[PDB]
């Protein structure tokens, strides 16, 4: 957590409904947007911190 891994995601087509097949998590917490509508709107860059 002191050296959290940041990865830039750009120039691709995202399908967030595939994400539920990757990890066993209950909910998909979101501030600003909704997990239902994330396939509709689209963004410039997506930054994944781990």
């Amino acid at each position: 957590v002191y050296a959290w891994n940041r990865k830039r995601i750009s120039n691709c087509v995202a399908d967030y409904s595939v994400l539920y097949n990757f990890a066993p998590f209950f909910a998909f917490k979101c501030y600003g947007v909704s997990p239902t509508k994330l396939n509709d709107l689209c963004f410039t860059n997506v930054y994944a911190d781990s």
Partner: protein, 49 residues
Amino acid sequence: FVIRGNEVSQIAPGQTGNIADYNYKLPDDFTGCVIAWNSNKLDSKVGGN
């Protein structure tokens, strides 16, 4: 019914997905209750259920 644990949030008014669009859809003016509980020991088989 029986649903996977990451899809219980789809059982709500105003939600769409796989199950909320193809299997079980709730109305937006819903007046009711949704009860969910883990049943891994009753619905889990080591060879796959």
